[PDB]
Design a protein around this ligand. Structure first.
Ligand SMILES: [Mg+2]
Ligand SMILES: [Mg+2]
Ligand SMILES: [Mg+2]
Ligand SMILES: [Mg+2]
Ligand SMILES: [Mg+2]
Ligand SMILES: [Mg+2]
Ligand SMILES: [Mg+2]
Ligand SMILES: [Mg+2]
Ligand SMILES: [Mg+2]
Ligand SMILES: [Mg+2]
Ligand SMILES: [Mg+2]
Ligand SMILES: [Mg+2]
Ligand SMILES: [Mg+2]
Ligand SMILES: [Mg+2]
Ligand SMILES: [Mg+2]
Ligand SMILES: [Mg+2]
Ligand SMILES: [Mg+2]
Ligand SMILES: [Mg+2]
Ligand SMILES: [Mg+2]
Ligand SMILES: [Mg+2]
Ligand SMILES: [Mg+2]
Ligand SMILES: [Mg+2]
Ligand SMILES: [Mg+2]
Ligand SMILES: [Mg+2]
Ligand SMILES: [Mg+2]
Ligand SMILES: [Mg+2]
Ligand SMILES: [Mg+2]
Ligand SMILES: [Mg+2]
Ligand SMILES: [Mg+2]
Ligand SMILES: [Mg+2]
Ligand SMILES: [Mg+2]
Ligand SMILES: [Mg+2]
Ligand SMILES: [Mg+2]
Ligand SMILES: [Mg+2]
Lengths: 46, 117, 56, 120, 110
RNA sequence: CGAAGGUGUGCUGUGAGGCAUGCUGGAGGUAUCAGAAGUGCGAAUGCUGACAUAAGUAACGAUAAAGCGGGUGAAAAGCCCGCUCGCCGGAAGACCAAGGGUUCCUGUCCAACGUUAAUCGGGGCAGGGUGAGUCGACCCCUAAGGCGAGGCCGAAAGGCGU
RNA sequence: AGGACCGAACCGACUAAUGUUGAAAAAUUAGCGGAUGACUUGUGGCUGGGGGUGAAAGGCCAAUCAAACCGGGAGAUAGCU
RNA sequence: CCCGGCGAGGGGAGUGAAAAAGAACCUGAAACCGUGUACGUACAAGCAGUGGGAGCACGCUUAGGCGUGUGACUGCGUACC
RNA sequence: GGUUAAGCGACUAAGCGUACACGGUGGAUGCCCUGGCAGUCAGAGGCGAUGAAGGACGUGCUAAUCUGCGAUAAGCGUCGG
């Protein structure tokens, strides 16, 4: 069956990537949270 | 003041499992089962300290009846005749005499018969 | 379908009382080569009753 | 039940059974001794020995029957030019089965099946 | 003289190897080697290697003979289990155990 | 000249417990009287880990199908070679995009991984391998749509839009 | 010419059997419907939770839908077990 | 050094206070699984114990109807929360 | 003494049980702290277009990761210790 995850790297990065996050005040707070938690991978990006 | 239980808990469970030696299966190996087995054993032992006294008198009486009937008298008349003769020997001794001294028991019987006569 | 109680150590070993292997009762001995072999089977060296039945 | 029935099924269909004993019969005739499983060797007797029997009479009809049963003209030739004459005086028993133990991968009872006069 | 050999962490369940180990217990060593040679079990390959090593240990380290050696003690213990994940229908995972065993043979003359 | 702990034994107390000591253990322990508590577990379809049971049972994943010879090897139904057989053939062949990212090739190893064995492997280790003016991307151009200098609007955040 | 006819790809899913700790958290097999259209499909884009979208089944909105998911208020409250 | 497949694993030798500290490594409980020994068990019915109790085995003693383990047979007895 | 009869009867353990001994599995317990928790006294309370926080890639006799550093790259100069 067609499952829910159908990978596209362009759409991955436009939806969840660094610049998509930095584009909005609320995405910038996501990165802040993930910096505060000490995330190795801050975003999907590469 | 954090208190760990391992040492006291191991000792508490070991005490029960030692009391459960000889029991079948998990009753000698598994605390949950062993604790129930050891408690029920104590309940039975309490009960049977009482039943032991009933059972032995039941045995003493049966042997007195046998010995008496071999000497021509039932247990009931024999006990009565001994009361009428003021013999206070109890059932544990009469039954020991019936087995181990059959001449003395015969003398007790002729004393009992004499008192009913 | 499934058990209502855990079977014991004992009943397990009673079921496994018919699981023992039978050792080969005796081995045959070829007349020519002296090799021990399964009866009615050729030897490791390729001998059979007294004949070398295989090339090697 | 299987009362009075012959033929091992060998966990195959008929067409696979016929194909493989054709291949096995040719391999036995070619090499004169093959290692195989014991029930396959016992059934190959019922395939190879009628071929050798047929090969005792060299005729175009018999080479064609053998070809129909072997589909290999090296085998027909060897049957009719080597094995027919070698077994011309033998009334059957053209093969010998030699039990040879057990296979490592599956513990299958194994056997060599020889032609009785290999004389390599 | 008791001479020991062991296969530790052998890939086989102790139940399987015990079937074979029960064949050669208390037997003359040459008899045991014959039984194992013609016992169609993977465990008989493992138990024969250990018995063969115990024999060589007894010669090289602990004396001489071969013909006076008997399998005095043989037992198989359970070793550590390797745990794997076998997927089943409906996303149900099943943890299968790949059991291992410690085989020990004690060969002895007296 | 052997602490805690572990494991037995013997004695002892109405009980929770206590004392002694053998063995293990190999460095901590602690009387007494007071003091303070994460202070006592068998249950909570309790939590975590370990280990049982069913059971050496079901199953080993399309019923396209194998057979033999030779080779290598500790070992070969499964690897290599070869002869046949059978299966697909608008595919079960071939070339890509997407996605994955070294799975490619070679040598070497077989613990684990592979629902079996494995000498084999998309497994482990090592080394090698991707060569562009013309292919593609980048690039020029724009679509939907997005962002959007100023601007209009909006408690703030922001929204819309040139 | 045709929301035309038969019928493969393609899109679907009427029946039966299998399967029901599956080969598969919806499939397989044999048949079945549509198959130039109100068709189908690729790539990208927009719509965001009392909100969306809905040839309307309360259907669908990441195996979750009579109000998604995540985190928080939060150790809600639980005259109940 | 030896068995083993120029394996895994093991036995020796050696190191060390110790390898019953050998890297799966201080201590090394329990469940759980085994080997060995003693006793019991194949005419026997049920919470598997308890009270009684022979026999057998094994340690004491000096005779002494004591210890340990087992437990035929028999009275009673339907777990825990 | 022999036979026959008729009473009675040990010795079996495929396996199982109980106990003891020796082991295996397992990693509790105790002992241990380079790590944490809570505070006290003091400090410093900001960093950033002189390009931050945080990252990516690189940097060694270096195959990897960590730490440090930034093509002057586990480091350069200078003044002191
Ligand atoms: Mg998206
Ligand atoms: Mg079959
Ligand atoms: Mg799935
Ligand atoms: Mg309770
Ligand atoms: Mg389980
Ligand atoms: Mg069953
Ligand atoms: Mg079955
Ligand atoms: Mg089956
Ligand atoms: Mg398959
Ligand atoms: Mg790789
Ligand atoms: Mg390759
Ligand atoms: Mg192997
Ligand atoms: Mg394998
Ligand atoms: Mg590889
Ligand atoms: Mg705008
Ligand atoms: Mg503006
Ligand atoms: Mg139409
Ligand atoms: Mg299909
Ligand atoms: Mg269909
Ligand atoms: Mg149509
Ligand atoms: Mg409705
Ligand atoms: Mg859904
Ligand atoms: Mg709701
Ligand atoms: Mg919050
Ligand atoms: Mg609550
Ligand atoms: Mg070695
Ligand atoms: Mg240790
Ligand atoms: Mg251990
Ligand atoms: Mg009996
Ligand atoms: Mg019964
Ligand atoms: Mg036995
Ligand atoms: Mg036993
Ligand atoms: Mg302490
Ligand atoms: Mg910076």
């Amino acid at each position: 069956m067609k499952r829910t995850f159908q990978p596209s790297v362009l759409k991955r990065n436009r939806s969840h990537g660094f610049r998509a996050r930095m584009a909005t005040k609320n995405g910038r707070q996501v990165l802040a949270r993930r910096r505060a938690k000490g995330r190795a991978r801050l975003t999907v990006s590469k | 003041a954090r208190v760990k239980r391992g040492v006291i808990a191991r000792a508490r469970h070991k005490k029960i499992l030692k009391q459960a030696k000889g029991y079948y299966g998990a009753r000698s190996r598994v605390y949950r089962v062993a604790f129930q087995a050891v408690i029920k054993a104590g309940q039975y032992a309490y009960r049977d300290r009482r039943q032991r006294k009933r059972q032995f008198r039941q045995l003493w009486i049966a042997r007195i009846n046998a010995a008496a009937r071999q000497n021509g008298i039932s247990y009931s008349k024999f006990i009565n005749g001994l009361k009428k003769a003021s013999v206070e020997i109890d059932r544990k001794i009469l039954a020991d005499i019936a087995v181990f001294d059959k001449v003395a028991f015969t003398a007790l019987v002729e004393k009992a018969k004499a008192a009913l006569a | 379908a499934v058990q209502q109680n855990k079977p014991t150590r004992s009943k397990r070993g009673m079921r496994r009382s018919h699981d023992a292997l039978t050792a080969v009762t005796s081995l045959s001995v070829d007349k020519t080569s002296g090799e021990k072999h399964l009866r009615h089977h050729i030897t490791a060296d390729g001998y059979y009753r007294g004949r070398k039945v295989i090339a090697k | 039940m299987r009362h009075r029935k012959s033929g091992r099924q060998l966990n195959r269909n008929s067409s696979h059974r016929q194909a493989m004993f054709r291949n096995m019969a040719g391999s036995l005739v070619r090499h004169e001794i093959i290692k195989t499983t014991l029930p396959k060797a016992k059934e190959l007797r019922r395939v190879v020995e009628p071929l050798i029997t047929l090969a005792k009479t060299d005729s175009v009809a018999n080479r064609r029957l053998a070809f129909a049963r072997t589909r290999d003209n090296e085998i027909v030739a060897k049957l009719f030019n080597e094995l027919g004459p070698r077994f011309a005086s033998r009334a059957g028993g053209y093969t010998r089965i030699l039990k040879c133990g057990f296979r490592a991968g599956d513990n299958a009872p194994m056997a060599y099946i020889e032609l009785v006069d290999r004389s390599e | 003289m008791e001479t020991i050999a062991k296969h530790r962490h052998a890939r086989s369940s102790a139940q399987k190897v015990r079937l074979v180990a029960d064949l050669i217990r208390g037997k003359k060593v040459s008899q045991a080697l014959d039984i194992l040679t013609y016992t169609n079990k993977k465990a008989a390959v493992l138990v024969k290697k250990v018995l063969e090593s115990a024999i060589a240990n007894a010669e090289h380290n602990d004396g001489a003979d071969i013909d006076d050696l008997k399998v005095t003690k043989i037992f198989v213990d359970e070793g550590p289990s390797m745990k794997r994940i076998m997927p089943r229908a409906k996303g149900r995972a099943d943890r299968i155990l790949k059991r291992t065993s410690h085989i020990t043979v004690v060969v002895s003359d007296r």
